């Protein structure tokens, strides 16, 4: 609280529907303005839809030709997103948003869409150990590289999340069609592998989870 | 009252 | 169509020190009921933009005195005083008197002193080997400025495919950057060379740190 959450958006296909929702809780649905908006890499922010309290009046970014539905359900408390004839300039990160007299106070988390022809494929997890005959000091530096996914985007957490202070997480880059990422974690290097360092690697869009144990 | 003002 | 203009697009500020981003409209933004619906928006790394002043001059719940919205027509300022690392990020103005737009952001960065990156490499793992596939990692981290450079060789020689290189945001910690480099090749060309080099030109040294691995010790 507040709160807004979208729901998983994902991957489709040109010309097919999708539809996105987003559940509001905290404060009366009926009573406030709802809307979309969107952000593109490389392009900013994009305001795509709002609707009125009832339902009764929307507006719609003017160059999606209709395309777009926003709808609200006051019984369960849910703002939609119908998308369709789905076009490849539609990917993007979607917001769902509460307007206030124009202006957007609660925000939430934001959930991907890609529209692509492309087969899901889940990540490939490699461990990154110090190896060669290297030293170490005082310190160690591992990490895991995550390679071959589509679309984006994945979370990676170490230790299930109870490793968290040094860690780095480095943003994804499209190769070859297919996403590759990295992230890093240092620990103090009289500690492992005394004491394990797992990287869990997590892709919603092929329900796959991948949990790798770093080894020297 | 509005909330969108471009709109109302 | 109304059109949000920004400056400066980055904007780097000591700590403690004020900065000043300027955010112009293509139209007056005085609506005919007589307000002004202009706001400004903060979005930090890897987080959802969230409303910092509305109309001009109002602090959203929760935003220091610190941060102060002006302007009129189509002319308006976001100060922010005595800057905190943690203000790190991309400042969106947005209009909503006209069919709505927003600014293109500025990104406030932090200045600290110059720092050289942590290097590390990796040998492809087995895992990945196994595969058929061989890529080659080197993290830089906690360095500063941003701007730095990485030279990949294989036995001495440069080369300039098969290289993606990845920066995080700042870190409102310590107010450095990180990168990762891999160097991804085929088992086939892997299994032909010995001699695998990252080198990092940064100018925080006069010459660039190098790390390097030969493929028969691993």
Redesign the interface.
């Known amino acids: 609280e507040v709160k807004l959450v979208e729901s998983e958006g994902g991957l489709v296909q040109p010309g097919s529907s999708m539809k996105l929702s987003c559940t509001a809780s905290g404060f009366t649905f009926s009573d406030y303005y709802m809307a979309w908006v969107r952000q593109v890499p490389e392009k900013g922010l994009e305001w795509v839809a709002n609707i009125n309290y009832d339902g009764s009046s929307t507006y719609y970014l003017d160059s999606l030709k209709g395309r777009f539905i926003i709808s609200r359900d006051i019984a369960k408390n849910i703002l939609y997103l119908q998308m369709s004839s789905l076009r490849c300039e539609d990917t993007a990160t979607y917001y769902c948003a509460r307007l206030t007299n124009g202006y957007l106070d609660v925000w939430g988390a934001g959930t991907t869409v890609t529209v692509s022809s492309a087969k899901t494929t889940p990540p490939s997890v490699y461990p990154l150990a110090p190896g060669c005959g290297d030293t170490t000091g005082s310190s160690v530096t591992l990490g895991c590289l995550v390679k071959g996914y589509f679309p984006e985007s994945v979370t990676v957490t170490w230790n299930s999340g109870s490793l968290s202070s040094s860690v780095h997480t480095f943003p994804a880059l499209l190769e070859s069609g297919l996403y590759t990422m990295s992230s890093s974690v240092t620990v103090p290097s009289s500690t492992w592998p005394s004491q394990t360092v797992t990287c869990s690697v997590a892709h919603p869009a092929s329900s796959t989870t991948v949990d790798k144990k770093l080894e020297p | 009252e509005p909330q969108a003002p471009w709109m109302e | 169509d109304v059109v949000m203009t920004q400056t400066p697009l980055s904007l780097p500020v000591s700590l403690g020190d004020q900065a000043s981003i300027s955010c112009r409209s293509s139209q007056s933004l005085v ?1 005919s ?1 007589g ?1 002004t ?1 202009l ?1 400004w ?1 903060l979005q930090k790394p890897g987080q ?4 910092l002043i ?2 001009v001059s109002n602090r ?1 719940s929760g935003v220091p005195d610190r941060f102060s919205g002006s302007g009129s027509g189509t002319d308006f300022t976001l100060k922010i005083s005595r800057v905190e690392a943690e203000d790190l990020g991309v400042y ?1 103005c ?1 209009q ?10 500025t990104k406030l960065e932090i200045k600290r002193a110059d720092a050289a990156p ?1 290097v ?1 490499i ?4 087995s ?2 080997l196994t ?1 058929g ?1 061989a ?1 080659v ?1 080197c ?1 830089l ?1 906690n360095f500063y400025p941003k701007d730095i450079n990485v030279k990949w060789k294989i036995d001495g020689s440069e080369r300039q495919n098969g290289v ?1 290189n ?3 945001d700042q870190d409102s910690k310590d107010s450095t950057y ?3 480099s ?1 160097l ?1 090749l085929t088992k086939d060309e892997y299994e032909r060379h010995n001699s695998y080099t990252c080198e990092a030109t940064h100018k925080t040294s006069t010459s660039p740190i190098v790390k390097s ?2 493929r028969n ?2």
């Open positions: 609506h009921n307000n619906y706001h928006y959802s933009p969230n409303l509305y109309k959203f969106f947005s909503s008197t006209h069919v709505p737009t927003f600014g293109g952001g942590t590390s990796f040998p492809p793992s895992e990945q595969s596939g890529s990692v993290f981290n993606l990845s920066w995080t990180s990168m990762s891999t991804t691995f030969n010790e691993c």
